[PDB]
Structures are given as C-alpha cells and as structure tokens.
Paper text:
Protein tyrosine phosphatases (PTPs) play a critical role in regulating cellular functions by selectively dephosphorylating their substrates. The ∼280 residue PTP catalytic domain consists of an α/β structure, and biochemical and structural studies have led to a detailed understanding of the catalytic mechanism (Barford et al., 1994; Zhang, 2002). Key features of the domain include the PTP signature motif, the mobile Trp-Pro-Asp “WPD” loop that in the closed conformation positions the conserved and catalytically important aspartate residue, and the phosphotyrosine recognition loop. Here we report the crystal structures of 22 PTP domains, including two tandem-domain RPTP structures and a detailed structural comparison of this protein family.
In the fourth category, both the gateway and secondary pocket are blocked and the inaccessible binding cavity harbors an aromatic residue or a proline in position of Arg24. The second-site loop assumes a twisted conformation in these phosphatases. This architecture is present in the subgroups NT5 (PTPH1, MEG1), NT6 (PTPD1, PTPD2), R1 (CD45), R2B (RPTPμ, RPTPκ, RPTPρ), and R4 (RPTPα, RPTPɛ). PTPs with particularly high enzymatic activity against generic substrates were RPTPσ and PTP subgroups R5, R3, NT1, NT2, NT3, NT4, and NT5. The subgroups NT1, NT2, NT3, and NT5 exhibited a pronounced preference for acidic residues N-terminal to the phosphorylation site.
Author numbering: 638 to 701, 703 to 716, 719 to 913
Amino acid sequence: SLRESMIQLAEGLITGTVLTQFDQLYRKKPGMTMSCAKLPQNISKNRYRDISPYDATRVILKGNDYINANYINMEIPSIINQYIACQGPLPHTCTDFWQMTWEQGSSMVVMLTTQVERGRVKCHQYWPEPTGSSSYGCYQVTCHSEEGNTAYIFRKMTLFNQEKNESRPLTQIQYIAWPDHGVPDDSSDFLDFVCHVRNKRAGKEEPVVVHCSAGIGRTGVLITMETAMCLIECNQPVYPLDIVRTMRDQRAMMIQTPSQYRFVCEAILKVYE
C-alpha cells in the first residue's frame, strides 16, 4: 500500500515516467483569481511579475491589506499541517512580513535561501544581527542567539508589538547550503534540517512561515518533504504528484522545476530506505 507507492516511484525514476507526469500537472488551478497582486497599489509588493498569490487563499493584513503569501494546509489521511508560504521580504515589505507573522500567531520562520545567491538579492535581511534589535513599524525584533553548522542556522528572537504592548518568542531556521545552481547532490543535510523543522513545530496549531525568494520552489520542497514524512508515519501511500496538486490548489506553482521535483522524489525514496 505504501510499499506499492514506493515501487511505482522507484520505477518512475528509472522509467523516466515521473518527470513526464510532473510536466502534465497544472501550475495554476483553473479559475482561481490572482488579481489583487495586479492592482496598481499592490504590484510593487511582488518580487516577480509572474508569481502572484491566489486571491482565494492569500493572507490578509489587518492594515488596509496585501502580502505575497498564501495559507497552505496539508491534511494527513487517517494532523493538518498549516503553513504560510510566502516570498522573501523586499526592503519595503518588511513591516508587512512581521505584521503577518504576528497576526497569524506564528512562532517559527523557516528561511530556505541566502540573501545573495550568485550576485542577486534573493531576500532582504528582515531580522537584526545577534545581540541587536531593529524596528519594522510598530514591531521590534530583537535577536538573542545564532547557532548553526555549515548547513543550517537557528536564530532565537523576540518579536515585540509596540501597538499592543506585547511580545512573543520566535525561532528562525535558515538552510544556508543550497547550491547556486540546481539542487543538492546529497539530500542528507536537507533531510536533517526538515526533522528539526518538525521537532520544533511540535503539536503547536499555528502556521509555520516558510519562504525562499519567490516562495514556490524550495518552499514546495520543504512542505512536500514534511507531508511525505507524516504520510509515512501514519502508514499512508506517498504520491509526490498529488502532494504538489494539493499545494498548487492553495498557492500557484509550488515546486518549480523538474530538478526540484526529481530532488523531492529521490529524497522521499531515500528516506523510505
């Protein structure tokens, strides 16, 4: 039943069949509106012209209203993991980033990119250097710790709301060993990272925020890995094509390239062994 799903997946990477099947799945769920991202006021809060959030599942700021961010909820048959999948903050949407995190009650922010891959700004540094604080509107982030190996970094922070005189604790995990070109050769450092993400998620019932640069590629990989890992614990079949379909119903284009899909498929099969 699960073993049957992993023979189909294994013969599909030999077969060459799962890359073929990947190319058929839609990128945008037909008929889902994405026309806020295209409103004159909101266009410049988007990192790419062609990565917009579905109106139907976008995260709505209490301000007004817009951030490039969607709720993604992943149900496990027979546990509904909540995420907010979002782009990496731009310089001018940093206050929006922290407004979202506060209002949705997140206590964990998973960052899947470095700030400058090749010679390009992929994400704005929206948190202060350790021992530091910085202000984003009425929110003040102060950062206590920075510990991590050559593959990932854990930052312990306090996020403080000055408008509501209150402060919550907050943990950011950043995976810093993604290659500039393509996908990792060995998934073993990434897999370890995903486990950490799960230990600290725990049985908390709030969205974990997860971003890369556009918040569709690596972000889809991370959510596809954590889903696949609970499917396995519950003895449920694992069909990577269907995990992406569920994701894509909730944010367009999750898992961007064939190579990332191949990565997630080969990762899942190595995790099952």
